[PDB]
Amino acid sequence: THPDISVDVLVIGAGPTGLGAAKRLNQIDGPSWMIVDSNETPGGLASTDVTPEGFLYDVGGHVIFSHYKYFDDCLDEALPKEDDWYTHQRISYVRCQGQWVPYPFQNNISMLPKEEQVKCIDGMIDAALEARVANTKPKTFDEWIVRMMGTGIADLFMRPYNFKVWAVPTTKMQCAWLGERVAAPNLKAVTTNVILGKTAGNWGPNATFRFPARGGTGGIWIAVANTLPKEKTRFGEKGKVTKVNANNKTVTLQDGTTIGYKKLVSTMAVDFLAEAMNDQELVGLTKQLFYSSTHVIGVGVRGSRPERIGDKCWLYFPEDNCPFYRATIFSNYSPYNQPEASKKLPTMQLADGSRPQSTEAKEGPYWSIMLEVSESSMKPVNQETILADCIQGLVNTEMLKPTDEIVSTYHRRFDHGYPTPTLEREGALTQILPKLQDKDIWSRGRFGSWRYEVGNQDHSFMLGVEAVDNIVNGAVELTLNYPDFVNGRQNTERRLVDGAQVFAKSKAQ
Amino acid sequence: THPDISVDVLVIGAGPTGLGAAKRLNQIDGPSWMIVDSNETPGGLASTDVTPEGFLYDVGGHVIFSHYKYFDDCLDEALPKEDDWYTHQRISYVRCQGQWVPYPFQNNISMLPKEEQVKCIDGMIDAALEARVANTKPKTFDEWIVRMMGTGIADLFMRPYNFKVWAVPTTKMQCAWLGERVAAPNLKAVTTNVILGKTAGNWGPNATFRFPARGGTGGIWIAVANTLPKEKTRFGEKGKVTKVNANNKTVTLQDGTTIGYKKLVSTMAVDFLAEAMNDQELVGLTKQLFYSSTHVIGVGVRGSRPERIGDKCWLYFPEDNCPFYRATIFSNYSPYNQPEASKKLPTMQLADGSRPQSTEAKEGPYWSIMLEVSESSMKPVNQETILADCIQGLVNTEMLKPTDEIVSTYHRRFDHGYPTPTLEREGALTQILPKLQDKDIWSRGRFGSWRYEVGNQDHSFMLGVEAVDNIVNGAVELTLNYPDFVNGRQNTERRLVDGAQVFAKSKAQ
Amino acid sequence: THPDISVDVLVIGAGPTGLGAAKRLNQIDGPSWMIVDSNETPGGLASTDVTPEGFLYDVGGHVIFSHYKYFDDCLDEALPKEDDWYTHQRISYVRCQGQWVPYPFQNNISMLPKEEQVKCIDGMIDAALEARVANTKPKTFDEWIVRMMGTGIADLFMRPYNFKVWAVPTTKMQCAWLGERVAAPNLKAVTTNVILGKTAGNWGPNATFRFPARGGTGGIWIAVANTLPKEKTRFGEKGKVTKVNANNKTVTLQDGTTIGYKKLVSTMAVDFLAEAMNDQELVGLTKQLFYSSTHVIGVGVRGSRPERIGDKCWLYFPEDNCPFYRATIFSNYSPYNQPEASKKLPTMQLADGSRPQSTEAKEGPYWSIMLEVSESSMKPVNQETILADCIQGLVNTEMLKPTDEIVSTYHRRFDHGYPTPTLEREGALTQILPKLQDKDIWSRGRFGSWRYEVGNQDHSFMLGVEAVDNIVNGAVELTLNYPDFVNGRQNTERRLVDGAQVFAKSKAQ
Amino acid sequence: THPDISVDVLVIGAGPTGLGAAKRLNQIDGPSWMIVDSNETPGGLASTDVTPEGFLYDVGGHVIFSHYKYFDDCLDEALPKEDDWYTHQRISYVRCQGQWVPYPFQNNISMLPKEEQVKCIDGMIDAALEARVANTKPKTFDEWIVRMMGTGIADLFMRPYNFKVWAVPTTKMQCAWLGERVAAPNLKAVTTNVILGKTAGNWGPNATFRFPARGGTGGIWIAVANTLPKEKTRFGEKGKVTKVNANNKTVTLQDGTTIGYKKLVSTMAVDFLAEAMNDQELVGLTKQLFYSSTHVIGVGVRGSRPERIGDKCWLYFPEDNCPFYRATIFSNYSPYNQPEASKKLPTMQLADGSRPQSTEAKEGPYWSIMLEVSESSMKPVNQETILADCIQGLVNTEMLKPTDEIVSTYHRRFDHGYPTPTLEREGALTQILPKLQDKDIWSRGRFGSWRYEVGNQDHSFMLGVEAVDNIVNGAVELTLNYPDFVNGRQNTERRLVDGAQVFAKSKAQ
Ligand SMILES: [Cl-]
Ligand SMILES: [Cl-]
Ligand SMILES: [Cl-]
Ligand SMILES: [Cl-]
């Protein structure tokens, strides 16, 4: 008894990873393939939401910066017109003691009060002298910090902030992931800037970036999926996978439709995957992994963009006068993230939480803020108060004046938000992934392969591409196994049009 | 006016590199392609010669050990029968003061005289204490040695030997190439073995290897080429390339035949390539590169294999009592490298270089030795005395008794022998290679891309494979740009039968 | 009501320290003075005992080596004849696994079995690499060892031996005292000797020494005291101090005699001193100090000196096959330490502990051995079995053959044997000593000032001298406060005849 | 034929050293003794001069701070009245780029311009990282500096200043003398003060000091000598030593008087001593020593003490806009160093070097400045222009306004000023001193024993004391042989009234 549908390569999930697989499969045009997703709209965590008032809110204000030329080719193909994109310079600060400290914090001590300046440069002189002599290697995130930064910067910013975002103490996670995330402060450069009162905030791959004019990031993946053959897609309740039988290589959908495959590329959360396989063993293994939930909070406000805010992009909040670890001036990314000035909206409340003087609709214009709050078994949150708490914090930090008029509110909780790089991670992955591989299953993605080091949109897209390239042309999966390798180079070899296609075209003629 | 022949991808040279290109082109079966070589017999430097007496002699006694599963697949395909191959354990020693010191030398100080033992462990204690504190990096080969080994091992073996083989002083070459060539001695392990009088010679990828039963290594590449479509090859005076016009992408052969190409894979020496292009600039660049010539000397001798020699494979000779830097007991690799016992041969001379007592042709059996002597502008040799000199050295080292009967002699000089890893190398390559790339020319191979780190047979084969995989499927050329990456891992992803081929068969059916 | 006797400077105790005080007082001939001791025979711990059979036994076989020229002057004065002294070369070994390892142990690894050789040179390479980089300081004896020697030499000899002698673990004592006691092994020198199989045993101030012909060391201090004016001494039950009243500066003897003083030099144990003062506070302070008791065991044996023993002086026994930590071939120091060959003595028992064949007395000659066994609250001993145990150990170590005839036995327990350099020591001394100083009381000596670093006979003698020189001419007490200073130099300034005397005798005439 | 005079101990020179010898000789009252000097007024380099206008000028503005309680006793005895002494807090600065940098310079980088601040903290971070790893020792003064300070502070202040004072480059002197002279900057403390803009100038034994009310320092040694028995002194042309016959221990004075001695204490310059002995050998040895001459310049000026100067004591001048290396506000030490306000004096010239408008005698009050200029064969000076040059420099540094009225000028050149701690010094001393010792000659003092480390007034006094204490009571000469020992402790043992005298007094009664 055959299955209803049979293909060479089946792709579960239409996030950036699944779509990466589809794109290369479609470019190659060899093996038969199909892609499914439980949602009518492709995009996954990189999709966009909208309030009844007309305010767009991503899942933490995503920003596009690419390590791969192939990733660029697909974006250019889906959104080829100049006015589809905005190019921005990164403006980021850290809130510490009534001060905006330029990112990255550890490179701009010259912007702290004199007292803290002293405590930071002292712990940093200590660390520099020991690091001159050490020959072992840091084993925890906390160790890495102390050795690279000093106990001063650690107690002032690093320790408190990272718990506020990762939802676990720095002592409980590894330090092999931060190659391109955490800057390592140079003693000379930092004290030279303290003496001269200068800043240095060009560090990182974030320095410059771009953002889609309309639809947010979610609009990118809708455009990208539109380049695929409709008949090879299956999005919605009709494409929801509820069972995976690795032994006879068949998938069962929600409606009972069965699909047979030779190779499986699964981009759903690995822990859900194991559950869908009824594989008691893999379940016991996945439960050894750790993740944190993400609360996204959106606030629409009336008025021209205050100068107290200016051209700021995103901001970190280590202190405990607010529940969120970051805030984004979303309205700065594109004028289409919020209604036009001519649209009339009523005031729901003032920043201080009281009612408005007038229950009528008035003109704008408007600007928008979005916040993020982390949660775990080590850091619970109260959903029915988190929204109000976030607004209070906006006042306590002077983001909003108590009299500022709030026009729109937004709150959503994403269960799987961050793949936590705990100490136990690699212990579980080096078992889980190979075991799945032996069943011809390539589990890839942010929660497919569970590796933050390489868990951005471009990374995920390429995890899908390379998985397919591995199944078809026997390419090595560099992104999955060698983060530091891909992240440290310009990946310019693989293109949306390779020689294989050019030589096929010149043949057909 | 069109060219006589036109193909998508043209491959110049049928050495291991050229044949690697052909093999993957043929496996993919997409773009049109052709391969040419100036010699009727494919194999290049990995080919075999024969004396009128029936003695086989490689080009320095080559040995097969593979980093790539794909390389294995092709070898298994060409020589699929068990009795086509012999598997050997590496037996190698170094001649120092009437002693056979187990390879690698620096790990077996426990086998030197007491006096030298002391001078070696002293310089090695010094180096170990400084290396505990250094934070810079060695810039020359000589520095690397002193830092990793000590001044004792350097003056006793490293310095004198390396000049004897590389044909230039250690102070004039870099140290980025030796990752898998030069062992780094551990202080504890070495002194622990000096106290206990033990050996340690398992180090390196040479430990175990295999060798073809018939035809030497040259037989492998003849078998491999036989798997290609004859009509797509052109070997002999008819396939010799005498002109390359990069501007209009045409090659001109010896007979005047012209070939047009879209992509060019050239495996000939890069300096000859530049000359064939009449590109004055590239010529001036190539001349900045450095290489050494190789003299191969073969000696056939009568008698059962002496016990003074036993199951020895190859031997290094640092001292100055002989001109050669290495010697191979070729007759140990396969019984088919020399005549059978029943064959009758006359004696040409005795080891001491005097006439034999009998000129009459007698039976055997026989064994065989081959030697290597390096040459450069920094180390000239006398061709008309080198043969005699080599034999004398065989006596001075007690390899041959002065009365041993010599049945066959062999001598040949290969101009391009070693690609010298000088200090100036990367300065020239980072210009030459990219400039050729801009003309759609992939120059690859031992003297195609000129990188010893990755200049073995398997390496070369894969430089050709990956070049093609780059032109067609946009794969990254890992071997060419990341020697330490490929050399440190098991490259098991790329096979002779990939999914693209598996799927295409199940589709035809 | 005046005291029966009144002097400027009173000296309690006629040990080497007390006698040092007396000697300088007598040389200066200024202030009035008197010296008392509870024993008819002066000498203290440096006195000698005798068995009814005619065997001399010191208190652990003392050996004379001087840091001070002044100490030499007094010895030359008391024993001026060439034949009063024997000069010896130090012959010392350590018993480890059926081997005699030349002193010092850590400098002669070349004399251990091959297996232990490896374990010792490994821990020593580790230590040498860390010591290259450390910048802190060792805080315990155990730390000092590990850092200077390695964990190999520590577990094999250092740790077990030191507990066997000090009667407390190495982890519970400081490391400021070992400057001239514990050798610091040089990595180069030690491995150079392991390769060549050489020894190095010239280290220390013990290398060469002398020993008195008659009476043992006790004979020296009897001769020295004989140079003092009899009327200023008071030795015996008549000189025993039973009460010290610091407030009104009076001492009360056993017979009720009272002595008044201006300055007091007390050489008795500081803890007994505090008790004699009825000073509740000082008592509580002294009890914070730590000491170990010493068991001295003497064995006289018949026969010419075996060659298994030869010219050996003293030997250390780290292993647990015997209770003693050291043994001395006392009969080697002087022919007068035991009876002459012509003396007839009966056999008491054989080494194996069995009855003798005959009771009748027979000639000699004889040789002698003395042993030392430590005791503390951390290491109890059984007095009524220790003698037998010691003999058994002499058999287990092959010092005596089970059939060797024992002629004389000796056993005595000295309560205050070693001033233990615990971690708490300096904490108590820096309080006790100054508090006594404020009452014009100079407490000096092995148990007077309780500092092993400077607790040899010459040290003690000079503690007395310098105390008097401090009271009279305001000299600094270098020996008491700066052990490393005096021990590292040739103290040649102070003589038995200073300019004062030579200038006063040229005055009279 | 006997000498005219005979004593046990003869002391040549009545400087602080000679007088120290006399004082202890007189206190002991044993051996006979006598002290001679070529000058009617005792004091040596520690004496005071006076201008016809009534201005006192020392030999570089001397300042009293004591390491020895014995030194205090003698000063208290000679000047026992409270109002004989003034107690001062040290106020010292360094002139660098129109800035007064608090002493010590290296500890107050926080007071330099921003540009120099950076160059100093950079070289200091380098040095701190290397010093973390070094295990050798600095061999030259220059090395010591670079290692302890950095190349920044070295080029800015250390190198140029030290040549200006020592009269030789820093590369030509040793670094064993600076223990209590040159501060070693702590990286943390210095950057902590740069961030906070604080100062730290409590370092050194100079922090607090005292100064005699009248007569300058010269008044101290006149008072001290007045405590000696006149008949045992011989000061003036009658006490000038012109010949020393070590062989028959006799000294010949200027008038022909001969003195016989048993022990000789010579405080004159060791090179002059050798000359007076006619000892060709010692002469050749002394000439291997190095010294620099000192020019003292005194300037008296009219007016109330400007505020531009305030309570400043002494100031260093590294820059090249003036010839002097230091300046002292002598009028701040005591109101008796210059005339009273009521005294009338004519103006000799204005600071700018031009005539005054008035050849007229007017009132005061007045203040005083004295300068020091070094000279050697490596740094010549022009005597007939140095006075003018010094005044010009006072203007260029803004010490004096060009219009300031000069009332008194003073200039004198002292040939032997500084005992240069060259590299060759200890090579010569370890020969010269012992050779003299073998002739019963204690050569002590600034130029007697030639050791700057211990060349202050208190040091010199004690060199004399200890020399006598050595000759008489056999005390060790700690000061002469162990600078770091005496300088690092409180020498409280030796008093002007020792027990020998207390006991001798209670006996006479
Ligand atoms: Cl690949
Ligand atoms: Cl074969
Ligand atoms: Cl690739
Ligand atoms: Cl002394």
UniProtKB/Swiss-Prot annotation, chains A, B, C, D:
The keyword Nucleotide-binding applies. GO terms for biological process: cell wall organization. Its EC number is 5.4.99.9. Changing R181K: Lowers the catalytic efficiency. Changing Q106A: Lowers the catalytic efficiency. Changing S92A: Lowers the catalytic efficiency by a factor of 14. NADPH binds at H67, R90, S92, Y103, N202, W314, Y316, Y418, R446, N456, H459. It holds the Pfam family NAD_binding_8. It catalyses: UDP-alpha-D-galactose = UDP-alpha-D-galactofuranose. Signal peptide: none annotated. NADH binds at H67, R90, S92, Y418, R446, N456. The UDP-galactopyranose mutase appears to be an appealing adjunct therapeutic target in combination with other drugs against A.fumigatus. Galactofuranose is absent in humans yet is an essential component of bacterial and fungal cell walls and a cell surface virulence factor in protozoan parasites. Thus, inhibition of galactofuranose biosynthesis is a valid strategy for developing new antimicrobials. Changing R446A: Lowers the catalytic efficiency by a factor of 2000. Keywords: Cell wall biogenesis/degradation, FAD, Flavoprotein, Isomerase, NAD, NADP, Nucleotide-binding. InterPro entries: FAD/NAD-bd_sf. Changing Y103A: Lowers the catalytic efficiency. Belongs to the UDP-galactopyranose/dTDP-fucopyranose mutase family. Contains a flexible loop (loop III) above the si-face of the isoalloxazine ring that changes position depending on the redox state of the flavin cofactor. Homotetramer. UDP-galactopyranose mutase, key flavoenzyme of galactofuranose metabolism that catalyzes the 6-to-5 ring contraction of UDP-galactopyranose to UDP-galactofuranose, the donor used by various galacto-furanosyltransferases. Controls the biosynthesis of galactomannan and galactofuranose containing glycoconjugates. The flavin functions as nucleophile, forming a flavin-sugar adduct that facilitates galactose-ring opening and contraction. This is UDP-galactopyranose mutase. It comes from Aspergillus fumigatus (Neosartorya fumigata). The lineage of its organism: Eukaryota, Fungi, Dikarya, Ascomycota, Pezizomycotina. The gene is glfA.
